[PDB]
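Q: For a teaching session next week I want to show students how multiple molecules come together into a single three-dimensional assembly. I've collected the sequence lines for a complex. Could you give me the predicted structure tokens for the whole thing so I can convert them for display?
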Amino acid sequence: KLQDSLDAGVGNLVDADLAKESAKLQSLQTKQQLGVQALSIANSSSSAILSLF
Amino acid sequence: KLQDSLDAGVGNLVDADLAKESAKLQSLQTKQQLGVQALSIANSSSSAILSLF
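A: Of course. Below is the structure for the complete assembly, covering every listed component.
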């Protein structure tokens, strides 16, 4: 019983809660796509000046 | 006879009614599956915003 409680305690110390990581994963994938889109918007600022010339 | 009645009384105090636990077990397994499905629905809320960009 003592060996089982030491192993369960190690699990309390280091194990991930995977049900919570699933939510973090989905939101982070959406954030990465929005970040690529925002960088694409920032890249195009120079093209606006071409119209004046 | 007194020893048998003391042992039966301990059983009245602590024993589980397993026919009732079988119903609780089945309903709880269904509830766990529905909870995983509900968490899966909640995880997907961010993906709706990607359409606007």
